[PDB]
UniProtKB/Swiss-Prot annotation, chain A:
PROSITE patterns: RIBOSOMAL_S26E. It comes from Homo sapiens (Human). It is linked to Diamond-Blackfan anemia 10: A form of Diamond-Blackfan anemia, a congenital non-regenerative hypoplastic anemia that usually presents early in infancy. Diamond-Blackfan anemia is characterized by a moderate to severe macrocytic anemia, erythroblastopenia, and an increased risk of malignancy. 30 to 40% of Diamond-Blackfan anemia patients present with short stature and congenital anomalies, the most frequent being craniofacial (Pierre-Robin syndrome and cleft palate), thumb and urogenital anomalies. This is Small ribosomal subunit protein eS26. InterPro entries: Ribosomal_eS26 (IPR000892), Ribosomal_eS26_CS (IPR047864), Ribosomal_eS26_sf (IPR038551). The modification Phosphoserine is found at S53. Belongs to the eukaryotic ribosomal protein eS26 family. GO terms for biological process: cytoplasmic translation; negative regulation of RNA splicing; translation. GO terms for molecular function: cadherin binding; mRNA binding; RNA binding; structural constituent of ribosome. It comes from the Eukaryota. The lineage of its organism: Eukaryota, Metazoa, Chordata, Craniata, Vertebrata. Residues 86-96 have a biased composition (Basic and acidic residues). Component of the small ribosomal subunit. The ribosome is a large ribonucleoprotein complex responsible for the synthesis of proteins in the cell. It is found in: Cytoplasm, Cytosol; Cytoplasm; Rough endoplasmic reticulum. Residues 84-102 are annotated as: Disordered.
UniProtKB/Swiss-Prot annotation, chain B:
The keyword Cytoplasm applies. GO terms for cellular component: cytoplasm; cytoplasmic side of rough endoplasmic reticulum membrane; cytosol; cytosolic small ribosomal subunit; extracellular exosome; nucleolus; nucleoplasm; ribosome. This is Small ribosomal subunit protein eS28. Belongs to the eukaryotic ribosomal protein eS28 family. Component of the 40S small ribosomal subunit. Part of the small subunit (SSU) processome, composed of more than 70 proteins and the RNA chaperone small nucleolar RNA (snoRNA) U3. The gene is RPS28. It holds the Pfam family Ribosomal_S28e. InterPro entries: NA-bd_OB-fold (IPR012340), Ribosomal_eS28 (IPR000289), Ribosomal_eS28_CS (IPR028626). CDD domains: S1_S28E.
UniProtKB/Swiss-Prot annotation, chain C:
There is a cross-link at K32 (Glycyl lysine isopeptide (Lys-Gly) (interchain with G-Cter in SUMO2)). Belongs to the universal ribosomal protein uS7 family. Component of the small ribosomal subunit. Part of the small subunit (SSU) processome, composed of more than 70 proteins and the RNA chaperone small nucleolar RNA (snoRNA) U3. Component of the small ribosomal subunit. The ribosome is a large ribonucleoprotein complex responsible for the synthesis of proteins in the cell. Part of the small subunit (SSU) processome, first precursor of the small eukaryotic ribosomal subunit. During the assembly of the SSU processome in the nucleolus, many ribosome biogenesis factors, an RNA chaperone and ribosomal proteins associate with the nascent pre-rRNA and work in concert to generate RNA folding, modifications, rearrangements and cleavage as well as targeted degradation of pre-ribosomal RNA by the RNA exosome. NCBIfam families: PRK04027.1, uS7_euk_arch. Its main location: cytoplasm. One of its GO terms (molecular function) is rRNA binding. CDD domains: uS7_Eukaryote. The modification Phosphoserine is found at S127. It comes from Homo sapiens (Human). The gene is RPS5. This is Small ribosomal subunit protein uS7.
UniProtKB/Swiss-Prot annotation, chain D:
Component of the small ribosomal subunit. It is found in: Cytoplasm. This is Small ribosomal subunit protein eS25. The modification N6-succinyllysine is found at K12, K54. Keywords: Acetylation, Cytoplasm, Ribonucleoprotein, Ribosomal protein. Belongs to the eukaryotic ribosomal protein eS25 family. The modification N6-acetyllysine is found at K3, K12, K20, K26, K54. It comes from the Eukaryota. The gene is RPS25. The chain holds residues 41 to 115 of 125 of the full protein. GO terms for molecular function: RNA binding; structural constituent of ribosome.
Amino acid sequence: TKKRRNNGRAKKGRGHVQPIRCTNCARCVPKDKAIKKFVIRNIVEAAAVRDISEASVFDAYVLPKLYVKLHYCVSCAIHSKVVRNRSREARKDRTPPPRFRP
Amino acid sequence: RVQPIKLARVTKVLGRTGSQGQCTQVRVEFMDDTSRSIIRNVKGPVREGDVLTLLESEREARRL
Amino acid sequence: DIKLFGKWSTDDVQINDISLQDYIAVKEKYAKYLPHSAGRYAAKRFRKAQCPIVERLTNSMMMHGRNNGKKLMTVRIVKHAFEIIHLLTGENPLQVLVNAIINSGPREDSTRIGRAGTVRRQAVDVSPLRRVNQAIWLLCTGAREAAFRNIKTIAECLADELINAAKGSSNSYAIKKKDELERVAKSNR
Amino acid sequence: RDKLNNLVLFDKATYDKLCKEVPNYKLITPAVVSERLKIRGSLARAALQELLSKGLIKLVSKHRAQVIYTRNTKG
RNA sequence: UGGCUCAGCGUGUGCCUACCCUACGCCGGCAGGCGCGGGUAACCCGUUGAACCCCAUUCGUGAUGGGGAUCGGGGAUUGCAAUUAUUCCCCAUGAACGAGGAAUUCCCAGUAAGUGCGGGUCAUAAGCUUGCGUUGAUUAAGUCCCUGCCCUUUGUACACACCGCC
Ligand SMILES: [Mg+2]
Ligand SMILES: [Mg+2]
Ligand SMILES: [Zn+2]
């Protein structure tokens, strides 16, 4: 059965879509098909900030970040458990999951 | 040259770990430096406020 | 003050480390005339801690089949042994025992499940309660194994087990298995 | 470590060893003197009760299985 | 080896159906035997004087005074019937076995284990079983790793249902 009207990709008016290799398994994936992560991590640990701030020779030395763009085929994405299967109704919504800010 | 044995006091219990329970994860602070506080996983029964031996400063640190 | 076995007042002994200061139970609060009590200490977690450590050693000294219920034989051999260590050292037998407990307690260990390098994989330091529990068992086992095919008795075998642990000469099975543990834990960091 | 084959009874070279150095150290039992002088152990009980009648060795415990003695106060 | 010193279950004389539980005294070294009773039972066995253990003796690290396997001789009870040895006692030989591989069972406080005692099976009876009692710990107050279970989601070409199908 046609599981998604989306057909698992964003290709609507496009005839062809250039491919992008997976980061983990190193496999070609269609570009809009692959789930794209944009991690902005701390360049240090959460607990390393206290030790770094002492060694830093600047008083108000702001902490750099880590701007990495990640590409996952759904095989590596499920293995990393970044995406999960949803029910038939729960599959429909396209909003991002909550950000856990508070 | 080598780091001698020091002591640290458990303040809070994080939860179980080791996928069997034989290791419990807790948060400790060092009696030598109260501002110095890390997270250490221990084995055996632990309550809040006790103090335990430590043969090295930092081995593992992670969040469940 | 309590004069355990009629002598050896408990008010003189001390624990040299504060990780064990509140995890040994020879204090004046836990000062008992006799190391025998059906006090139901083990019906709850964090309740064997206040059980007198002399009571705990007495309980842990009976093992291996023919000796699991026999407690009067254990208390008497404990009494014989404590006079033996008091004679051989000149000082308080509880101080002989307490030094044995501290010096034989394995400060760290290691425990994992998956594929391991030699024995274990990751090193995890033990709790002070585990330090006392393992030291008591290791001292008891050293006496138990030393008295299996030799003319020596339990009290004297326990005496050298406590003494070699208290001073430290790598003759106590309680410290020898402790250091054998510390080697593997450090190497598997 | 195949046999101990201790002498059941004393000879001249061990009778004097028992009576010149055994009542010199505090830790004395039929067990300890057995691993020092290489004696049987039933004879050791007989010898110890001899030395108690001779009066050079004090008693401490006197139990049916763990009978212990000691040296008198030195100095 | 001798002395000391303690339990709780629970049971006992028969329609058919013959067969109770035993105190005490005498004989025999013991297994047993002979009379004087009691109890159809909180009335007698029975203050159920059990074992463990407690205190002293000998043993003394040897396949030993551990071990009692195997086997010989003798004596007693039960039953018509004991040989293929019903059972028990006594004198004898004293075997393997010196803590047990890969694997694997049970268990969280009066538990395991030691330890005996009832009931059933019974003319004869327990290494079993069902219950009771004495002594009484270690570690743990957790996890889904190995083994399974429950709820939800999901895929299935399974529906005798994965030991499926193919
Ligand atoms: Mg499909
Ligand atoms: Mg196309
Ligand atoms: Zn991939």
